[PDB]
Amino acid sequence: SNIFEDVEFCVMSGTDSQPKPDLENRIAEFGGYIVQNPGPDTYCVI
Amino acid sequence: KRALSRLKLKLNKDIVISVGIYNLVQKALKPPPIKLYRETNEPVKTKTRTF
Amino acid sequence: NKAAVVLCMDVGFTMSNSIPGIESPFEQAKKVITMFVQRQVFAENKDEIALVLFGTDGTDNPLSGGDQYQNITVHRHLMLPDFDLLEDIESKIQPGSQQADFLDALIVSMDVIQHETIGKKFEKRHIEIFTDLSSRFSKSQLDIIIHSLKKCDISLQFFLPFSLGPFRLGGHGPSFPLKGITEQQKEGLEIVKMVMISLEGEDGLDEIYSFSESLRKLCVFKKIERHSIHWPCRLTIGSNLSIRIAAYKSILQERVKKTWTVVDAKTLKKEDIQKETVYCLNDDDETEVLKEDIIQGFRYGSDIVPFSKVDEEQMKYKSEGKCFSVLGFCKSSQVQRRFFMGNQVLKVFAARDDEAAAVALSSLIHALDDLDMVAIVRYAYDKRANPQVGVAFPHIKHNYECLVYVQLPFMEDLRQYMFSSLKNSKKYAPTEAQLNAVDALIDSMSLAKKDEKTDTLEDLFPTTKIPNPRFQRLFQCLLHRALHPREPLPPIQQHIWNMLNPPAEVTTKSQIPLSKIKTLFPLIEA
Amino acid sequence: CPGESLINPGFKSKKPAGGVDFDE
Amino acid sequence: LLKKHHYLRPSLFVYPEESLVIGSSTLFSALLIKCLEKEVAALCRYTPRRNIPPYFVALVPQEEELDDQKIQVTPPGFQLVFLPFADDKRKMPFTEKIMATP
DNA sequence: AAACATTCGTTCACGTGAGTTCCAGTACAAGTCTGGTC
DNA sequence: AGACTTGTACTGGAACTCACGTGAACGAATGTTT
């Protein structure tokens, strides 16, 4: 949504419940800037 | 197997025989590093320009 | 460290005498001194050089107040060499009609060195004297000069037009035939031999060189070469045995120590030219990215595996550096020279001060030599340096003994290439005539000779003592460009080709067998 | 050919690295 | 006269090609046989690529050797060893010789 | 007299550009298979 | 007519190697300061 925007998120280890591509698509649904490798301007690493 | 170079041994200005050079021993180096985009994780082209 | 080098030059009339078919001795001496100055200048060496010429019409030196030491001039005092000296020697130096001795020149050089060395501390003092020994000299001051040389502990070298049909400069042959030498030349040779043998004993006989020989021997810089930095370590056979050792780089490829800087044609400054690297993605937009937005990765067979620099450092193989550990001893026959790796050879001696390490290393070297065995060692320069496996073998000489270490290959450093045998090939099987022809060619092109049947071999073409021609060519071209900006580069000097070519005797002997092989052996391009 | 590696045909099967094996 | 400790660059392998010049294989084999039986290595100036300074190298013949299984381990040809130049060497510090008791 | 820095000097590791060998992809000509009608 | 297969040639990209250049760890020696 609007709140879940303008934020950089990185995921590198998904759970068996949801695979990594599925979680990436989900987070992209709300408008999360996906980053494969975290950088100096990353909110956190998942 | 791959010849380093196909050279031409020259006994004289007239006598000439083609030979090939190989390296039976060669230093082992790790694969060269590759630059990658931190976000998409895809190869990036590097271009050097002088001005 | 720094040193003073005084170059004594004879410009007498006899030198200008150019025997037909042979280059004049003056030209050879000029070439030798020019090469020495070029090496000392373009190499960026903190060495002081002065030039003293005897035989000149004029006279200019501190010891020329009276009638003594005439026809002696000091073209330059001790100081860092520059292009000015090269320009002066190349163009405005000519032979002098007046004839002068050489002992007076030596005394003047000693006075100059003594006067100039007061204001600075010099580790080594050197004198090089180039003369044909064709002028009368006074023997009154022989004792004085000998005593001064002994007290001042300054090295001295002599270069002569003749060493102790066609003639080539540095052609690995007889430069000056021993037919035409005059009595004065014989007396000069005798006196210089006496001086050299008294100064440095029997070893001094090798300190007198020839211009042609010196042009392809790298002997001018023999006594002004700085020692390599010692690498201290501890040879450890086990956890209780340790011998302090020092390693030097005995053999290492020499390259140019100065790079080529790119400058603008309009303005000859490197500031104007600026180089920048821009990274773009594989897309039509060609979006640019910053350095901080870049990561390091490696290929894994069509798969890309990112590997950050910090990650690589954390997972990097960690080990302790500066280790010389003997992994074991193996028969010398088990190590083949063809497997040697690396770009250097190490010479390992004992520590500088202590003698216990010296005796231990000597015992180890002797045991290895008499048991025909070599030590497989683990070498690591520093913590960052990757460890390597090498072979150390004894090297015993009449004056010294050490361990020669050369790197060895790893399992993945070897290449398994399968070739086709030639002995059991019907199509490739030379006949008896072919073998006889090849035997004749090999015998006619021998580069070694029997040393009077004294169980020794004399090398006709000792390539190991030939200087690298690339440095000389580069220095020549740079000097030509500097002195003549509006001229092209000159061709390679003849003496370089002569020193890079075999003696004419080998070619003369091989003329006939080579033609015979050409006639016998078919050779058609395909 | 005897000793041919089953992974890479045309290349001799490199023997495993043993290291230092002190004899009797 | 080829000192073992005079090592400058890793050695290379020279083998006849016959793809460019025909009949070179027989001459190469004859040279290899004669050099092996005479224990003499050829000396040659080597220039790998264009605009490269030459280097004096020695071609030492190699004798084909096979293991118990008749598998090639030392392919026949020439071993090219680079001979260092005068400036490629270095001067070691003088050290007094000390002997060891038997 | 001892500790720090500094320096410095070196040397090793890493990165970039030019030459050589090998193979994938593309252009053109010809052989080969197939369509229909009078 | 057309389309596909075969060959032939021809070239450009990938991998390998070496030379050149640079950065930077680091190791020790020496000079200076306390």
DSSP for C470-503, written as a single string:
HHHHHHHHHHHHHH-TTSPPPPPPHHHHHHTS--
Structure tokens at C104: 């007076």
Q: Which of C213, B13, C64 shows the shortest CA–CA distance to E86? A: C213
- Asked if residue B6 keeps its beta carbon closer than 7 A to nucleic acid strand F, the reply is yes
Strands E77-82 and E55-62: antiparallel
B 24-43 residues, CB < 7 A, strand G: 26-27
Query: Cα separation of C264 and E24, whole Å?
Result: 51
What is the Cα–Cα distance from C388 to C206, expressed in whole angstroms?
40
List of chain C residues whose C-beta atoms are within 8 Å of the C-beta of residue B34: 296-299, 304
Burial degree of C443 (CB within 10 A; 0-12, 13-18, 19+): middle
Q: What angle do CA E90, C396, E36 make, to 5 degrees?
A: 85
Taking CA–CA distances from E73, the nearest residue in chain D reads D12
From the list D6, C416, D9, D13, the residue with the least C-alpha distance to E69 is D13
Tokens at C511, concatenated: 């003329």
Query: Residue C343: which nucleotide is closest by CA–C1'?
Result: F12
Chain B window 11-40: residues with CB closer than 7 Å to nucleic chain F are 32-33
Output DSSP code: residue C60.
B
Residues 6 or more apart whose Cβ sits within 8 Å of residue C26: C11, C15, C16, C95
Chain-centroid distance of CA C496 in Å reads 14
CA distance C176 to C158: 16
Residue C41 CB neighbours (<10 A): 20
Going by C-alpha positions, the residue among C151, C132, C157 that lies closest to residue C7 is C157
Q: Which of A9, A17, A1, A3 is nearest to A38 (CA)?
A: A9
Sequence-distant (≥ 6) Cβ neighbours of residue C62 within 8 angstroms: C108, C111, C112, C115
Rg (C-alpha) for chain D, rounded Å, is 13
Name, in order, each residue with C-beta under 8 angstroms of C41's C-beta and a sequence gap of 6 or more: C81, C82, C83, C86
Q: In a 10 Å sphere around its CB, with 0-12 CB exposed, 13-18 middle and 19+ buried, how is residue C364 labelled?
A: buried
Beta bridge partners of E14: B21, E78
The Cα–Cα gap between E73 and C418 comes to 8
* Residue C452: partners with Cβ closer than 8 Å, 6 or more residues away: none
Q: In whole angstroms, what is the distance from residue E5 CA to residue C406 CA?
A: 8
In three state form, how does the secondary structure of C105-127 look? HHHHHHHHHHHHHHHCCCCEEEE
Range 17-46 of A in CB contact (< 8 A) with C: 36-37, 39-40
Answer for B46: CB within 7 Å of strand G.
no
Cβ within 8 Å of residue E7, ≥6 positions away: C251, C337, C340, C345, C406, E81
**Look-up of token digits 């030599």:** C369
Any atom of strand G under 7 A from CB of C473? Answer: no
Per the structure block, which two tokens stand in for C363?
A: 């015992």
Q: How far is D23 from chain E (nearest CA, A)?
A: 22
E8 min Cα distance to partner chain D (Å): 27
Residue spans of beta strands (DSSP E) within C36-193: 48-54, 72-79, 124-130, 155-160
> Is the CB of B21 less than 8 angstroms away from the CB of E48?
yes
Main-chain dihedrals φ then ψ at residue C142, nearest 5 degrees: -60, -45
Dihedrals phi, psi of D4, to nearest 5 degrees: -70, 135
CB A9 within 8 A of CB A24: no
Which residue type occupies C343? N
The whole-angstrom separation of Cα E87 and Cα C463 is: 11
At position C263, the amino acid (one-letter code) is V
How far apart are the C-alpha atoms of C341 and B8, rounded to whole Å?
26
Nearest Cα neighbor of E71 from C340, B3, C421, C409 is C421
Handedness of CA C108, C114, C118, C121 (dihedral sign): positive
Structure tokens at C392: 């150390």
Query: What does this entry list as its resolution, in Å?
Result: 3.1
Give the nucleotide with minimal C1' distance to the Cα of E50.
Answer: F19
Q: How far is C423 from chain B (nearest CA, A)?
A: 18
Residue whose Cα is closest to the C1' of F10: C229
Residue C380 CA: distances (Å) to CA of C29, C389, C402, E10: 47, 9, 19, 20
Whether residue E61 contacts residue B26, with contact meaning beta carbons closer than 8 Å, is answered with no
Q: Which nucleotides of F are covered by protein (CB under 7 A)?
A: 10-17, 19-22
Choose among E13, E20, E44: nearest Cβ to B6. E20
Alpha-carbon span E24 to A13, nearest angstrom? 62
Neighboring chain D residues of C328 at a CB cutoff of 8 Å: 20, 22
Contact C368, C393 (CB under 8 A): yes
Note down the domain range covering C453.
432-523
Cα(A38)–Cα(B15) distance, rounded to whole angstroms? 65
Residues of chain C neighbouring E32 (CB-CB closer than 8 A): 422
Radius of gyration of chain E (CA): 19
- In this structure, the number of other CB atoms found within 10 A of the CB of residue C422 comes to 21
Q: Say whether residue A13 is in contact with chain C using an 8 A CB cutoff.
A: no
Residue pairs between chains A and B whose CB atoms are closer than 8 Å:
12
E10 closest-nt by C1' vs CA: G18
Dist CA C480 CA C195 (whole Å) = 39
User: CA nearest C52: which of C130, C124, C159?
Assistant: C130
Q: Say if strands C373-380 and C401-407 run parallel, antiparallel, or are unpaired.
A: unpaired
Burial of E12 (0-12, 13-18, 19+ CB in 10 A): buried
For residue C37, with 0-12 CB atoms within 10 Å meaning exposed, 13-18 middle and 19 or more buried, which class applies?
Answer: buried
Q: Which residue is associated with the tokens 């006075």?
A: C111
CA distances (Å), origin C465, targets C142, C469, D9, E83: 35, 12, 47, 10
* CATH code where residue C494 lies: 1.10.1600.10
Strand order in the sheet with C208-210: C72-79, C48-54, C3-10, C124-130, C155-160, C208-210
C446 interfaces chain E, CB cutoff of 8 Å? yes
Asked if E40 contacts E31 with a C-beta cutoff of 8 angstroms, the reply is: no
Strand, coil or helix: C512: helix
Q: From CA C157, how far away is CA E99, in angstroms rounded?
A: 34
Minimum Cα–Cα distance from B42: chain A residue: A36
The CA-CA-CA angle for residues C204, C207, C213, to 5°, reads 150
Rounded-to-integer distance, Cα C439 and Cα E35, Å: 9
**How many CA atoms lie within 13 Å of B2's alpha carbon, on the beta-carbon side?**
2
Please give the C-alpha separations between residue C237 and each of C127, C348, C361, C407, C410, in angstroms, as whole numbers. Answer: 47, 15, 12, 18, 21
**CB–CB of C12/C134 below 8 Å?**
yes
Protein-covered nucleotides of chain G (CB closer than 7 Å) are 16-22, 25-29
d(CA C212, CA C494): 12
User: Cα angle at C455 between C452 and C460, to 5 degrees?
Assistant: 60
Are B36 and C289 spatial neighbours (Cβ–Cβ below 8 Å)? no
**All chains having 3 or more CB pairs closer than 8 angstroms to chain B:** A, C, E
C-alpha distances in Å from residue C142, one per residue of C34, C185, C224: 30, 18, 26
- How far does the CA of C311 sit from the C1' of G7, in Å? 53
- From residue C67, how far is each of A14, C61, C75 by CA, in Å? 102, 12, 20
Which chain B residues have a beta carbon less than 8 Å from that of C295?
35-38
Nearest-angstrom CA–CA distance, E12 and B20: 10
E22 touches chain D (CB under 8 A): no
Is C205 an interface residue toward B (CB < 8 Å)? no
Q: Which structure tokens are listed for B3?
A: 């010849």
Query: Which residues numbered 312-351 in chain C sit less than 7 A from strand G, measured from CB?
Result: 321-322
The CA distance from C298 to the nearest CA of chain A, in Å, is: 15
C178 contacts C193 by C-beta, under 8 angstroms: no
- The rounded distance, in Å, linking the Cα atoms of C489 and C481 is 7
